[PDB]
Design a protein around this ligand. Structure first.
Ligand SMILES: [Mg+2]
Ligand SMILES: [Mg+2]
Ligand SMILES: [Mg+2]
Ligand SMILES: [Mg+2]
Ligand SMILES: [Mg+2]
Ligand SMILES: [Mg+2]
Ligand SMILES: [Mg+2]
Ligand SMILES: [Mg+2]
Ligand SMILES: [Mg+2]
Ligand SMILES: [Mg+2]
Ligand SMILES: [Mg+2]
Ligand SMILES: [Mg+2]
Ligand SMILES: [Mg+2]
Ligand SMILES: [Mg+2]
Ligand SMILES: [Mg+2]
Ligand SMILES: [Mg+2]
Ligand SMILES: [Mg+2]
Ligand SMILES: [Mg+2]
Ligand SMILES: [Mg+2]
Ligand SMILES: [Mg+2]
Ligand SMILES: [Mg+2]
Ligand SMILES: [Mg+2]
Lengths: 101, 77, 328, 194, 538, 138, 85, 132, 49
RNA sequence: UAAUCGAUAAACCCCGAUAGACCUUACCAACCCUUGCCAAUUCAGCCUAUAUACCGCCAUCUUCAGCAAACCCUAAAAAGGAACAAUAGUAAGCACAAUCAUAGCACAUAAAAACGUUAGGUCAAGGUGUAGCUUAUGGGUUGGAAAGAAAUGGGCUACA
């Protein structure tokens, strides 16, 4: 199993975003330019809206890997602020130490 | 090591003008495809075949949607 | 634990031979400094505490001083002061008092015979002699000591030293004396240099508030300062900044008698002026005699400025200004 | 049936060669090291912990396989693979006259299962304009053609290529740009007359 | 092996068991990897190492007969089931599809072979080149070469040439069948050899390897054709492998027992062999070094034992001997010689290098240590060898401890080695009484050890422990200990000696009674001298 | 005493293609602790001295990356815990090398690189001139 | 969901709550029992719910002089072992 | 009061190892890191990919060596091959030790697509540094 | 892939090579719960029955 | 209002959250699925209640110095244990101190601060004992979670 149902749904969102990465990249090119006439751009808006909801990368939420905490998570280690401390204080992460200056 | 990129060279990545021959030369389609080609040519994250498919996608999309280009008022093929 | 230390001796010796074999140096010429370098190379532990680094020393250096056996196989203690708790300290005190009484009797006999041949050896100021601290007495007398007992021993030593001294008791007291280093805080004076057909040349370095300054001084030129290729008036429009520049020159009456080029990097408008002041002061030492260098360092030109910006602390505003604390 | 064996310390020879004991990187097994070494913060009445069961000694990297004798023995065997540097290029002044083109290439290493590092594709080319056959007109055209990638004070043209995924593609792209810049700085077009 | 002492093997059987346990661990992991491939489908390494990918034992296509066979041949019973399913729908199989299917049976796998072989010829007109490669290789282990001899004639009549692997098997097939006649079988091999050159196929290394392999089990006087074909190999330009010399050395070893002249032939051929760096390009190169040092160990030739030891490390120290059963025999027979020809210094210098490092001696090797120490009268190393024998030969301790202690009775006892004399005896005798038959000869050793050491107190206690063991030693020991007691003026021990000896009726009790009388006269104990006479009379 | 004989058998061949030349090979060794970097500096300098390269070694300034996290779990923002990451740099500056000499030095250097450190290799390849630019006129 | 698991010592320390804040002054003792059971008491390492026999853990390494392969107990033999445990 | 990575002091009879006897404010001062790799450096990447493997290795080794693990693992990462230094009590026989070491050296390699070394150091018991 | 991690560890626990103390604790607690008499009801009978 | 929750004296109030258009989101209204993430499990899953059962993490006294195992003594002992020209106190250890970091010292800062008090905060970082849901207090889709009559805390901008 996964840690949480929210994590379960986020994995599906990431998978479908990767599956539709190319299509959205191609459709957004027709919308983000001024050279082409607006008549085709209004239809481009329609087909980019016709895509499934979870396909956009905006719905992707960066949670923690271990505890799936939706907030307080560092991007470098993909770890929550609590699990990161729990590991660093035990010394299982290299180069990480208490700051004294 | 272990990544040859199908034995491609710099001319297969930088110069994609050879794939723009079946497009209107003097229309806004060239204005848009030249920016697309410039973007793809500065892309080290993709192989040559993926850029070929990227060009072919615009190819078939433009050749499929023919009524809109004729209705827009500009003569496009 | 005597046999354990004895085995540690042979283990340390065979390890020393094997370490010499590893490094390829002569085990006969292989010394403790070489042991330290060898361990620092083989086991490069990066730790801020030096005692946590791998260390290989003599067992009598690593292990503390162990108490010897206090009684024989018949149960009778060896020393006669064993039942006093601190046999070594009380034996030292007893010996000191016995020698005090011996000195008293000898001096009484000498005074009766009207013979004064002793001298005052109590003042050892030019040598810099001091009395042992409690730690230096605890490393000698292996058992633990007390502050009041240490003070009593020192006060008895003063009584012994306040009496006419002979030969043996002076040597006995001398082993309880430590010599201090020279607390002379005189600085090193840079010798006057001559570079490329130029006379009266010197250099100085200064640093204040993250601003590094180098001053090149010529004692044969006229009075002018060139800062970073431009004039000092242009570089320091503020009057106070130029007052800082005049502060070292005016004190030594060397305003128009030196030509100087200053190169300063970092800091703000006043930090650069202060760093240039410090560097200029440290550079003008060579062109003056010794009696004015002390006046200058007592005026504050030769001392750096450790007043640096303190780091902001979490939960506060400016490392001192706390948040608005609401009582209720 | 428990069985405890005395370590190799009692069997270690005094003149035994240490490269034979520690040829490659090892986790510093205490039974293979006759060196009695104590690592750790001492106790007020105790002493730093010995080598047996010491985690601090295992944490640190050991350079026992890189003792000076072993380094000598290893480097002596590598002399057959290396080639001799020509003495005709001892000083940079003749190196600039003979090989004026410099190719800055970046190589990276990191511990892990992965090799691909995106910073490895960047290739730099540095060429001095004082070693080419440009005339006055072609030089003044080339300066404005390149723009800010030419240093006026040092007279060096820099071409930094990233567009190609591979290092070899970036390299031959860079030499192509150098050739094209040289050839296009020579052509005087109609609009140059105004 | 792991370098931790708790994991370092102590004996050869322990090393073998540890290696086998480690191997069991690895293939147990591989079983999990193959059984659950979906847990290892994710790839992290960029170079995409293929050896770390899971393997699949399932066919890709099941419905198509032409596709199922090519998978099930390479992946035993499923191979036959694939043929049974392919022949159900009358699917035509060419000469290439079933050749590998037949090879699959020839590799793994009596009565089923005939049924399979009928499907080989009757079903399809298959090519002879793909027929013999299965048949002739199958019936050799099926123990029936008479029908392979018929397929040879079928192949000859079908105008198709015979490859090297045909004659590799046919010569051995006709050689193994012997009925009161060997010359006819050898002549058949000669006829096949002369047809071999006519059939325009060069005789490879393995052909002359097999013809020589055939000659060892029949005649001890068959070395003349063996040497002739040995020279015939050199005449063509093919460098022989190790087994080609090994079989010659084997037959020469067989003829070496009655006449020692062939040993010199072995030596002169070995001298020419050892002049180059070799490469094990033949799978049968394992027994060569076994034979080449058994020839030297039987005839006690260390001058060439050193050269045989030097031959293997010339090419490669490990790629020459396959199994550990043979490396143990290697080192045992090397050190059997090395101990007692060359000097004790050389023996001890090689002892610490071969005994604890490579492999642990067998029961044969340990006796050679004793024989090497006894001839040169070396005593300082006896406790040094005994401590290693405790850990290595505990299994043979009950059968070999008897001969490790006689060396002490042959040499003298210096006054500086009393502690070494005491420690070994104490360690030997303190373990058997806590559990191990105790022989009476070790008491005669401990008595003489303590006699010159002057320790009668410890010598007396251990004597009674065996007298209470329901067995009594000889009376020479009793007389020696009586001399020891009278030297220290202890008459109290002699009365208990004689009382517990005369009751068990030693054969030299008549002299034991005289020695106690002399001791009592010396120590002024005539009252007790008469008292013990009264006790023995009663 | 038992030393094997004929232990050496390498495969070395000399090709006719001219060897590549390098002017400066920069090595930036980054690590967490200074003792490992110092021992590695000693090892690399000594190994370069046997091969005759005349290395120059200097220490680039360190980089300290600090960040701040909450001290408690649910609600305490006045109290924080600050963590630190130190990165120390060593510069092995090599000059006057060839393609094969650089390859062998990098072999002996990277094969024994520690676990907690990383290396950045910057090669300045030498090249005289390409072909279409030597002395052409279009 | 494997990274969400902890050590049995940590599980028991929270289960028994021996260091609870209410048990310090004396508010506890209402349910006066604290029993901790070690789950690895009679747990032989090699045995599992599948009943696999491994030559290194459950069964000896060698039988009849030959190497033992990976085996598996029968359904009824596994049930007998289950009844024993 | 700080409570992270700290074993509390008992009446004076608990045995505590050197790693547990030091608070987290002593890391890199008195005690070192239990794992070394390059992802935690300044201009390097792929820190989380190694961190997740680190945690999985801790848990997998704890479950694989039940009750015989003395201290925490030392996870070295050096040129595509990861070494696992473990301190193990001599509770299992060497026959079962050698089964598990060989099992792990291949299972971990096939699960991480990278060579894995396993080194075991056998201790008679848990070594005690502070009071016991 | 937490699914791969969890499934792999569960399978090795079942074959007896990995030992999951947390899962053993859960199993022991659930066994005590079912013995005392408050277990997990069947699907479809909790509400109506 | 159909529309979360917790904190809410010092020790809450730009606090969980270094962060809310769908997601996040645990809230609500409409609709769908019930061995329903996993190899399997009369099983999964619950952000359901209990922080007055917990672990893990912290606030507070607190830059206070005391806590405390093994002992010994008191004309009995609930408890206390000190006189330095010394009258019953030895004492491992945890604290403090020392050391370490802010790359030269000193100072300063940072860090550390034991045993315990507030049944202090956190079942909603995560696991969890106990009591409760299982065609639902579980799992998915869509749309909404206003607004300020009013009071107050902390900051930014200024009133020159
Ligand atoms: Mg959960
Ligand atoms: Mg301020
Ligand atoms: Mg609220
Ligand atoms: Mg509330
Ligand atoms: Mg409160
Ligand atoms: Mg929604
Ligand atoms: Mg929402
Ligand atoms: Mg819910
Ligand atoms: Mg509470
Ligand atoms: Mg105090
Ligand atoms: Mg009391
Ligand atoms: Mg105390
Ligand atoms: Mg300092
Ligand atoms: Mg201070
Ligand atoms: Mg603080
Ligand atoms: Mg402190
Ligand atoms: Mg409460
Ligand atoms: Mg509450
Ligand atoms: Mg919960
Ligand atoms: Mg709740
Ligand atoms: Mg307001
Ligand atoms: Mg605030």
């Amino acid at each position: 199993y996964y840690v949480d149902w929210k994590m379960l749904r986020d994995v599906k969102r990431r998978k479908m975003a990767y599956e539709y990465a190319d299509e959205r990249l191609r459709i957004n090119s027709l919308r983000k330019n001024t050279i082409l006439p607006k008549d085709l751009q209004e239809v481009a808006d329609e087909e980019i809206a016709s895509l499934p909801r979870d396909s956009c990368p905006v719905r992707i939420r960066n949670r923690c890997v271990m505890t799936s905490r939706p907030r307080g998570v560092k991007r470098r280690w993909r770890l929550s602020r609590i699990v990161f401390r729990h590991l660093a204080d035990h010394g299982q992460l290299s180069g990480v130490q208490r700051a004294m200056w | 090591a272990g990544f040859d990129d199908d034995g491609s060279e710099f001319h297969e990545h930088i110069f994609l003008d050879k794939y723009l021959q079946d497009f209107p030369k003097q229309g806004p389609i060239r204005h848009f495809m030249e920016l697309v080609t410039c973007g793809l040519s500065k892309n080290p994250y993709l192989s040559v075949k993926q850029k070929v498919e990227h060009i072919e996608w615009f190819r078939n999309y433009f050749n499929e949607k023919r009524v809109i280009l004729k209705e827009s008022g500009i003569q496009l093929n | 634990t005597v046999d354990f230390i004895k085995k540690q001796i042979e283990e340390f010796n065979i390890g020393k031979r094997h370490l010499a074999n590893m490094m390829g140096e002569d085990p006969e010429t292989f010394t403790q400094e070489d042991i330290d370098r060898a361990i620092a190379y083989l086991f490069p532990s990066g730790l801020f505490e030096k005692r946590a680094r791998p260390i290989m020393k003599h067992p009598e250096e690593i292990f503390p001083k162990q108490r010897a056996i206090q009684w024989g196989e018949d149960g009778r203690p060896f020393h006669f002061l064993f039942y006093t708790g601190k046999q070594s300290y009380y034996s030292l005190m007893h010996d000191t008092y016995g020698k005090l009484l011996d000195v008293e009797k000898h001096h009484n006999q000498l005074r009766a015979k009207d013979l004064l041949a002793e001298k005052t050896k109590i003042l050892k100021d030019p040598i810099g002699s001091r009395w042992l601290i409690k730690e230096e007495l605890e490393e000698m007398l292996v058992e633990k000591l007390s502050d009041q007992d240490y003070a009593q021993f020192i006060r008895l030593l003063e009584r012994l030293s306040a009496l006419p001294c002979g030969a043996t008791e002076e040597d006995f007291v001398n082993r309880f004396r430590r010599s201090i280093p020279i607390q002379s805080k005189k600085q090193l004076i840079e010798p006057l240099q001559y570079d490329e057909q130029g006379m009266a040349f010197s250099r100085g370095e200064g640093k204040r508030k993250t601003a590094k300054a180098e001053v090149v001084v010529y004692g044969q030129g006229s009075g002018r300062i060139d800062v970073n290729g431009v004039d000092y008036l242009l570089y320091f429009p503020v009057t106070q900044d130029r007052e800082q520049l005049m502060f070292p020159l005016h004190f030594l009456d060397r305003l128009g008698k030196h030509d100087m080029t200053c190169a300063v990097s970092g800091g703000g408008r006043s930090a650069q002026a202060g760093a240039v002041r410090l560097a200029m002061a440290r550079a003008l030492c060579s062109f003056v005699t010794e009696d004015e260098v002390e006046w200058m360092r007592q005026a504050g030109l030769l001392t750096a400025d450790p007043r640096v910006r303190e780091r902001k602390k979490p939960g506060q505003e400016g490392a001192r200004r706390k948040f608005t604390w609401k009582k209720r | 049936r428990r069985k405890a064996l005395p370590p190799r310390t009692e069997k270690m020879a005094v003149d035994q060669d240490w490269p034979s004991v520690y040829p490659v990187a090892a986790p510093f097994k205490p039974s293979a090291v006759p060196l009695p070494v104590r690592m750790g913060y001492p106790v007020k009445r105790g002493v730093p912990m010995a080598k047996e069961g010491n985690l601090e000694l295992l944490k640190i990297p050991n350079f026992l396989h890189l003792t000076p004798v072993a380094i000598k023995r290893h480097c002596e065997a590598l002399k057959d693979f290396c080639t001799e540097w020509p003495a005709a290029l001892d000083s940079d002044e003749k190196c600039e006259k003979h090989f004026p083109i410099e190719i800055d290439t970046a190589d990276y290493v990191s511990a892990g299962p992965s090799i691909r590092n995106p910073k490895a594709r960047v290739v730099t080319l540095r060429v001095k304009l004082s070693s080419l056959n440009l005339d006055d007109h072609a030089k003044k055209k080339l300066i404005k053609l390149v723009g800010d990638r030419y240093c006026k004070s040092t007279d060096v043209l820099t071409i930094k290529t990233d567009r190609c995924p591979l290092k070899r593609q970036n390299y031959d792209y860079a030499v192509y740009l150098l050739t094209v810049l040289y050839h296009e700085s020579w052509k005087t077009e109609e609009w140059e007359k105004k | 092996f792991q370098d931790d002492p708790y994991l370092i093997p102590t004996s050869s059987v322990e090393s073998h068991s540890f290696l086998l346990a480690k191997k069991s661990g690895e293939n147990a992991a591989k079983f999990i990897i193959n059984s659950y491939p979906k847990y290892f489908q994710k790839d992290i390494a960029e170079p995409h190492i293929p050896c770390l990918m899971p393997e699949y034992f399932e066919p890709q296509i099941e419905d198509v007969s032409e596709a199922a066979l090519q998978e099930r041949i390479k992946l035993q019973e499923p191979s036959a089931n694939y043929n049974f399913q392919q022949r159900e729908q009358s699917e035509e199989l060419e000469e290439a599809t079933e050749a590998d299917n037949e090879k699959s049976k020839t590799k793994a796998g009596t009565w089923r072979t005939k049924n399979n072989a009928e499907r080989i010829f009757a079903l399809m007109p298959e090519k002879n080149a793909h027929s013999y490669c299965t048949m002739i290789r199958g019936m050799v282990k099926h123990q029936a070469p008479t029908q392979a001899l018929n397929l040879y004639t079928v192949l000859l009549n079908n105008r198709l040439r015979a490859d090297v692997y045909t004659f590799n098997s046919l010569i051995e097939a006709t050689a193994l069948v012997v009925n009161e006649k060997f010359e006819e079988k050898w002549n058949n091999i000669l006829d096949l050899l002369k047809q071999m050159v006519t059939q325009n196929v060069k005789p490879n290394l393995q052909t002359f390897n097999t013809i020589l392999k055939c000659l060892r089990r029949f005649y001890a006087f068959g070395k003349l054709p063996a040497l002739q074909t040995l020279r015939e190999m050199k005449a063509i330009g093919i460098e022989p492998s190790l087994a080609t010399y090994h079989y010659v050395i084997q037959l020469f070893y067989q003829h070496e027992s009655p006449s020692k002249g062939s040993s010199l032939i072995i030596y002169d051929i070995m001298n020419e062999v050892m002049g180059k760096r070799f490469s094990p390009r033949d799978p049968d190169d394992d027994m060569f070094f076994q034979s080449a040092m058994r020839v030297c160990s039987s005839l006690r030739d260390l001058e060439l034992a050193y050269q045989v030891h030097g031959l293997l490390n010339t090419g490669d120290n490990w790629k020459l001997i396959g199994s550990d059963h043979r490396r143990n025999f290697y080192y045992s027979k090397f050190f059997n010689l090395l101990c007692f020809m060359e000097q004790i210094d050389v023996t001890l210098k090689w002892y610490k290098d071969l005994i604890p490092s490579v492999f642990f001696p067998h029961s044969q090797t340990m006796i050679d240590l004793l024989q090497a120490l006894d001839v040169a009268n070396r005593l300082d190393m006896v406790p040094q060898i005994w401590k290693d024998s405790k850990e290595y030969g505990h299994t043979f301790r009950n059968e070999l401890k008897e001969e490790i202690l006689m060396l002490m009775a042959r040499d003298q006892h210096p006054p500086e080695l009393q502690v070494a004399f005491a420690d070994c005896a104490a360690d030997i005798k303190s373990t058997y009484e806590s559990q191990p038959e105790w022989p009476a000869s070790s008491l005669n050793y401990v008595a003489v050890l303590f006699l010159r050491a002057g320790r009668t107190q410890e010598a007396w206690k251990m004597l009674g422990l065996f007298r209470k063991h329901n067995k009594i030693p000889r009376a020479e020991l009793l007389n020696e200990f009586l001399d020891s007691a009278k030297a220290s003026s202890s008459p109290a021990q002699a009365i208990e000696l004689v009382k517990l000896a005369s009751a068990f009726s030693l054969p030299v009790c008549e002299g034991l009674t005289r020695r106690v009388m002399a001791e009592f006269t010396l120590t002024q104990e005539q009252r007790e001298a008469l008292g013990e006479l009264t006790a023995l009379t009663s | 005493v038992d030393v094997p004989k004929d232990m050496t058998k390498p495969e070395i061949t000399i090709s006719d293609e001219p060897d590549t030349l390098y002017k400066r090979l920069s090595v930036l060794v980054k690590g967490h602790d200074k003792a490992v970097l110092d021992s590695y500096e000693y090892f690399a300098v000594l190994a370069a001295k046997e091969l005759g390269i005349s290395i120059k070694v200097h220490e680039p300034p360190r980089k300290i990356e600090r960040f701040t996290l909450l001290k408690s779990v649910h609600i305490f923002k006045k109290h924080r815990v600050q963590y630190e990451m130190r990165t120390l740099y060593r510069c092995l500056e090599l000059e006057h090398l060839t393609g094969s000499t650089a390859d062998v030095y990098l072999e002996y250097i990277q094969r024994n690189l520690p676990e907690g450190v990383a290396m950045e290799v910057t090669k300045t390849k030498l090249e005289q001139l390409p072909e279409h630019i030597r002395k052409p006129i279009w | 969901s494997f990274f969400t698991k902890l050590t049995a010592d940590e599980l028991w320390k929270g289960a028994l709550a021996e260091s609870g804040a209410g048990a310090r002054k004396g508010r506890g003792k209402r349910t006066k029992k604290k029993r901790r059971k070690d789950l690895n008491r009679g747990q032989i390492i090699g045995e599992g719910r599948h009943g696999f026999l491994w030559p290194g853990l459950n069964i000896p390494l060698m039988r009849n002089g030959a190497v033992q392969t990976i085996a598996q107990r029968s359904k009824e033999d596994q049930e007998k072992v289950e009844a024993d445990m | 009061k700080n409570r992270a990575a700290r074993v509390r002091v008992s009446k004076g009879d608990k045995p505590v190892t050197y790693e547990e006897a030091h608070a987290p404010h002593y890391i890199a001062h008195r005690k070192g890191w239990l794992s070394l790799h390059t992802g935690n450096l300044d201009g390097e990447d792929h820190a989380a990919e190694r961190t997740v493997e680190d945690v999985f290795l801790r848990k997998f080794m704890l479950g694989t060596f039940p009750g015989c693990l003395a201290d925490q693992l030392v996870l070295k990462r050096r040129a595509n091959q990861l070494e696992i230094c473990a301190l193990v009590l001599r509770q299992l026989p060497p026959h079962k030790f050698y089964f598990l070491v060989g099992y792990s050296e291949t299972l971990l390699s096939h699960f991480y697509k990278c060579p894995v070394h396993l080194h075991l150091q056998t201790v008679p018991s848990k070594v005690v540094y502070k009071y016991i | 892939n937490h699914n791969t991690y969890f499934a792999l560890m569960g399978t090795l626990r079942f074959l007896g090579l990995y030992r999951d103390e947390h899962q053993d604790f859960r199993d022991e607690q659930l066994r005590l719960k079912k013995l005392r008499g408050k277990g997990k009801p069947r699907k479809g009978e909790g509400k109506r029955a």
